[PDB]
Amino acid sequence: SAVQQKLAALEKSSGGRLGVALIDTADNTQVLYRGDERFPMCSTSKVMAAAAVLKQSETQKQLLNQPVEIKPADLVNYNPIAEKHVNGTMTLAELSAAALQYSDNTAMNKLIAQLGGPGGVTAFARAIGDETFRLDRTEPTLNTAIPGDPRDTTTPRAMAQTLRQLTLGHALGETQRAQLVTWLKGNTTGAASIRAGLPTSWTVGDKTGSGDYGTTNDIAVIWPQGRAPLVLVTYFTQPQQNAESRRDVLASAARIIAEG
């Protein structure tokens, strides 16, 4: 099709590998580019950890208010929110918000611990029908993004379908789904990625991710003005381990998608 020719050209101009999945919830059409190739998730995996904890709170009604210690030993490489609360506590709700809206890596590791390890996050993916998602490591090593390494990867198609179920479907209870949507809409790290390629009137909830090999990711639920919402996943990774992030590529992919 036309969009796929433009995405391929975008990819060729960028020198990396681009994976795109769009689900238009209006007619459940999908637009896929390398939709079944694995990409390193990096911080986009935080959505699954947060959703898994939300799923637990459907039974444990007070779980999100449970205080969790933040100790100096918990801090890893990027902890913009957790650093503000070292030797104090944050609730699981506050940790989920920090993981999603600030990409706080300590918050992610606490969520993983709450779920019983990476295997507990992966289990939740399986429980909602995602057989592709796999979380193997904690922060920060899940971001190594080594070419060909299947660890901590998913495919654009799988992540799009799963993000649709979490935010627009009924994989979570209504209060949990609304909380997830509110968190994503309050993301602070996404201004230069998918959002930058979309009309400013469209409301976006997204989670970015970045890692080694210039890996630059964004997954988004998009509410266009007077139109059915869209789910857009854009993964991008590059051949050089030290390559710089290319958020502009995600913005351009979104722009190409939005033209249709």
Q: How far, in Å, CA of 159 to CA of 181, rounded?
A: 16
Alpha carbon 186 to its chain centroid, in Å, reads 13
Given the residues 43, 57, 193, 252, the one annotated as active site: 43
Q: What is the dihedral of CA 171, 175, 176, 178, to 10 degrees?
A: 90
DSSP element (H, E) containing 108: helix 105-114
CB-CB contact of 221 with 230 (8 Å): yes
Question: Active-site residue 43, yes or no?
Answer: yes
DSSP element (H, E) containing 89: strand 88-91
With CA atoms as reference, report the closest residue to 41 among 129, 154, 125. 154
Cβ partners under 8 Å of residue 174, min gap 6: none
Question: In which residue are the tokens 């979104």 written?
Answer: 254
Q: How far, in Å, CA of 102 to CA of 83, rounded?
A: 12
CB-CB contact of 39 with 250 (8 Å): no
Q: How far, in Å, CA of 260 to CA of 205, rounded?
A: 20
Cβ partners under 8 Å of residue 10, min gap 6: 18, 249, 252, 253, 256
For residue 21 the two structure tokens come to 């999945």
> What is the chain's alpha carbon radius of gyration, rounded to the nearest angstrom?
17
- Positions annotated as catalytic residues are 43
